[PDB]
Amino acid sequence: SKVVKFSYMWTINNFSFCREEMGEVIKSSTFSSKLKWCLRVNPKGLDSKDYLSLYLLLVSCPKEVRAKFKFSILNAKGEETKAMESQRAYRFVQGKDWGFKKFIRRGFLLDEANGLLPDDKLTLFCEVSVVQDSQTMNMVKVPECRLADELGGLWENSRFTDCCLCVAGQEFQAHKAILAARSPVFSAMFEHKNRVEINDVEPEVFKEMMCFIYTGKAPNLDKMADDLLAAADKYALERLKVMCEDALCSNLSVENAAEILILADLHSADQLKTQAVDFINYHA
């Protein structure tokens, strides 16, 4: 079970001044939480005339949605009054709407003795909740796998090493076997002499990529996701590429989506490239 709760504030200026009769509709800007919603309101009703009808309309979506909604009017103090809510989740589909034909009387509202229209402004507040659905002991305590941790020791203490990787002047002791089973790039090298010099990755980031090769974990990834991506791509480390595509994606912001997009085009980051594009548009 997953429930995404979001809301939208709509203000109609000089309400009592709208040239809408019985049946005319005035939509609002479309709002979001990847689907597009929007409110609809008929000032004089739909048939009946002595009421205001309010609907929640799912404007755009990629082919079915369950959602609960709550409509209400906000006073001047920002508080909530005259709230009506759907007692369950209704399903929406591209173009479908659900709401209340008889939301609030044309006359209880306009009466300034209730002030629901400060400066003759109607403040409609909508709250939407999109709901979506998503194992006895053994008696014998079995230790948790230590494979990664022990292989990590080989890297950390340089034990039984058999080759040397020169990273921009600095030398690092390694193991051809592990590097070859771990990287198509390294395997292809030891295939065709115990000394390989790396000229495309900085030492700090390197130590991190070797940490991954030996353990499947990259503890400091966050501090260097962009460089470790560049490195993961050059040495065919698919999982680490995506582990970085994931880190970068979670940091997408207004003032950086341009940058991260370029990174993705250069290092063929399918997933991250999508997430970055979709983000730029969501802020067009």
């Binding site: 609907y55 479908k96 659900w98 209340f100």
Partner: peptide, 6 residues
């Protein structure tokens, strides 16, 4: 009561 325009 909840309804749809459609």
């Amino acid at each position: 009561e909840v309804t749809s325009t459609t």
